[PDB]
Amino acid sequence: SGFRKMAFPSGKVEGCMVQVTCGTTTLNGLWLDDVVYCPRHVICTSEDMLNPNYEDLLIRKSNHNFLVQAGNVQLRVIGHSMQNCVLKLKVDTANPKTPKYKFVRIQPGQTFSVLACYNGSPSGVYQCAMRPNFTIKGSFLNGSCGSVGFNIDYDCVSFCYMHHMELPTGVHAGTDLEGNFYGPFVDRQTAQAAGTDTTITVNVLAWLYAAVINGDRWFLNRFTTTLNDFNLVAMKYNYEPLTQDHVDILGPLSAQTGIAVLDMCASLKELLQNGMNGRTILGSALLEDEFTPFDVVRQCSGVTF
Amino acid sequence: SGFRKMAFPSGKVEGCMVQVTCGTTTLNGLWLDDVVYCPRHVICTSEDMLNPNYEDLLIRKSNHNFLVQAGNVQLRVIGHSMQNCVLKLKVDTANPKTPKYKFVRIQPGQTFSVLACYNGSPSGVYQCAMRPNFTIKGSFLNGSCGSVGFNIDYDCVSFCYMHHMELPTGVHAGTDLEGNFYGPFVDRQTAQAAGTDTTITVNVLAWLYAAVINGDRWFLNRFTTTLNDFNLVAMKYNYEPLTQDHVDILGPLSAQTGIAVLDMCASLKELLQNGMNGRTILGSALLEDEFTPFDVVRQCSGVTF
Ligand SMILES: *C(=O)c1cccc2c1CCN2
Ligand SMILES: *C(=O)c1cccc2c1CCN2
Predict the structure, then answer these.
(1) Which residues pair with A122 in a beta bridge?
(2) What's domain B201-300's superfamily in CATH?
(3) Which residue on chain A is closest to B298 by alpha carbon?
(4) Which of A5, A114, A125, A277 to mutate to test binding with chain B, by most B CBs within 10 Å of its CB?
């Protein structure tokens, strides 16, 4: 029993983190096979923050301008290329610690582990969700650019996020590992801001199922609701609409607890309308939305890697 | 910016996790140099749960009764010994992945990362505190015995917890790596229960400093308090007493924010007496006590390993 914000073990990703330096700028890179992936912002200088043309900046660089360090071992760059907002540095050494991996672009509402790094050295690991507004609520200081987010499936690392920047509200924006930003953000200094966010309804429902699995039942009631009636209330409280696909995805948890999905929706409706009146759920006085249905199953049933 | 419940990168510990089987019981072990450490409960059977004499149980075993698996590689046990509630299996192979490490017995209020494992395979990582009542609020399923807790300092892993059992309230009890339980618990089936717990005051104060560092200031006020006056209020709300040692430990955060420790104590007093009136701090509607002063500094200043 118990329920924690649980990250994936980070070792397979630790072995891939490197430092990349170009000029005065140093940040983190991801070394997989003989390629290092990092934010293209590394080639920027202090005469460029305002709309730089990265194709011009890159044409003016040569391989010897890139310093890549894996631990105390310098790696020789033998080729360089740009893909969207990521740089690909070909190096002369294949990472012997390369895990089985793939690159995936995730949907809003999905969760992943972040390995926060500084100067190529991992510092900590934590769980994030991709918010509906395509930001993440991370924990990143200066030097964290190029830190990555990932899930692990069996023995395979699915990389889904590379960190680029902090927006004015303190939340974070970045790219998939092919260099495409999540959301409308761009890697240049402009007035961009996070859009209004919404709560991830299917995740709140999953977490209520987690609570039942762990013996928290005070919020249950005898009522049911219709999808349409529930979504009318969701919209009022700035919750994402709940689809039939979400209902089907919650099927396993509904079957394990014997609580129909639309019955749990009526409990959530009551929680939204009345609050918790001083009670907690799984140690939280707020409704938690950064656990997916799969996260609950994995932690309330114990799968490993 | 941002503030997350952040674990240490787990890779150095992943490389030490093994499976140990004796008879019908399988759990996790920790392989360091040529020794595997695991809960002595592994030698128990279904004719023993009620006060077993472990010295008798152990004298009746031989090395070939212990099956140790590291991945798909069986390790040959060449010696076995008991130390308090842990078994030490000498194996014929030194773990080539042994990190720099030490064993430490932590005080209540200190935090650590847990690498939850099943059958020798890591499944997830999360941050725990040792509660004042010497339980932890973990997340563990059947098969998690022998999972370990740890901190990392520079390149050194300080192992501080090995998981043994779940108590009736769903919280968790275990030992240091020398096999001594935290708290009054014993590894046998009896009516033992968690004692009444208390909130870790110095950690709440650290977290309020984290919030200020991150721009949450609504809970501040112009008042100060005396240590004695503050502790009178703490006791009322079942908070641990705050000592001068705690005040000195908060010195760095007090200096970075320019908020005297006893000034923050008066803010906490007001929060205890009046609640949050619908506001949040660092995304929480409760006062968080599982971040130490050192945890705040490391995450709000970015040290790595
Ligand atoms: C880090 O990679 C990065 C990417 C894009 C824009 C910025 C940064 C750091 C500062 N601004
Ligand atoms: C696991 O190691 C362990 C230790 C002590 C007591 C028990 C267990 C699991 C079940 N009871």
Answers:
(1) A117
(2) main proteinase (3clpro) structure, domain 3 (1.10.1840.10)
(3) A123
(4) A125
The torsion defined by the Cα of A112, A115, A118 and A123, in degrees rounded to 10, comes to 140
Report the structure determination method. X-ray
Q: In Å, what resolution does this model reach?
A: 1.6
Closest listed ligand to the CA of A117 = 1
CA dihedral (B292, B295, B299, B301) in degrees, to 10, reads 90
Comparing A11-91 with A201-300, is the CATH topology the same? no
Q: Please state the three-class secondary structure of chain A as a single string.
A: CCCCCCECCCHHHHCCEEEEEECCEEEEEEEECCEEEEEHHHHCCCCCCCCCCHHHHHHCCCHHHEEEEECCEEECEEEEEEECCEEEEEECCCCCCCCEEEECCCCCCCEEEEEEEECCEEEEEEEEECCCCCCECCCCCCCCCCCEEEEEECCEEEEEEEEEEECCCCCEEEECCCCCECCCCCCCCCCCCCCCCCECHHHHHHHHHHHHHCCCCCCCCCCCCCHHHHHHHHHHCCECCCCHHHHHHCHHHHHHHCCCHHHHHHHHHHHHHHCCCCCCECCECCCCCCCCHHHHHHHHHCCCC
Query: Catalytic: A41?
Result: yes
Domain B11-91 top-level CATH class: mainly beta
CB B214 within 8 A of CB B208: no
